[PDB]
A paper describes a structure:
In the coiled-coil protein origami (CCPO) design strategy, CCs are used as modular building blocks to design protein nanostructures. The desired shape is defined through the topological arrangement of parallel and/or antiparallel CC dimers arranged into a precisely defined sequential order, based on the underlying mathematical rules. To address this issue, we sought to determine the crystal structure of the most elementary CCPO, the triangle. We designed a triangular protein using three orthogonal CC heterodimers concatenated in a single polypeptide chain.
We designed the variant TRI-4SHbGCN where P5:P6 is replaced by a GCN2 homodimer, and the segments are connected with GSG linkers. The asymmetric unit contains one TRI-4SHbGCN molecule with a triangular fold as designed. The triangle is nonequilateral with a shorter GCN2 side (34 Å) and two longer (47 Å) P1:P2 and P3:P4 sides. There is an internal cavity of about 600 Å2. The electron density is continuous for the entire chain, except for linker sequences, where only two linkers have clear density and could be modeled in the structure. These two linkers are attached to the P4 segment, suggesting this is a more rigid part of the structure, as also reflected in the lower average B-factor for P4. Interestingly, in the linker connecting P4 to P2 both Ser100 and Gly101 become part of the P2 helix and Ser100 side-chain hydrogen bonds to Trp95 on the preceding P4 segment. Therefore, the structures of CCs incorporated into the triangular fold remain essentially identical to the structures in isolation. An unexpected feature of the structure is the interactions between the CC segments at the vertices. A closer inspection of the TRI-4SHbGCN topology revealed that the chain forms a relatively shallow protein knot, known as the trefoil-type knot.
Residue numbers in the entry: 2 to 34, 37 to 133, 135 to 163, 166 to 198
The structure:
Amino acid sequence: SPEDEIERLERENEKLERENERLEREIRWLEEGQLEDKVEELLSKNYHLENEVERLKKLVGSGSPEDKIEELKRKIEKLKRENERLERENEWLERGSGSPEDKIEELKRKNRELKEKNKELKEKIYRLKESGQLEDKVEELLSKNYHLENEVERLKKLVGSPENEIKELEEEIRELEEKNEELKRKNEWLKR
């Protein structure tokens, strides 16, 4: 089915999109690097991020709400993708296949573009890394900087009251389940 194609290419492109962004940043740091200077300032940046992780960790008194919020955010993601799958089929049934096939065409063009750039970016980094020892240190420290960045934001999506948060997410789940049901009713109505 066309929507099986659409889903696949969106999955693959977003990952490419994310991975290319990281490579862009690495090259931007290694071309700009005076590399010893760049290393020092990455240490300080990672130092500041690790203390923020610690600060935010202490603002979390219990992991039990954290677990719950994480669980609800996952459920919300499941429900949204399923609602999107139902809306696409419903549009397709109502309005025909010309709209997916153009979307697919655009998605396969961007996919090829994204992969071409990925290969170029990755090729540039190997060249940039080259008989250099500082260069790997810079690689690791940027990688660490990426993970600490992600960790600070994870702890920011939590801390504000954790139970007010669970209250919100559970209301959103009610809305999505209501929407899911309407979309399935319209779908069965169409395929009758």
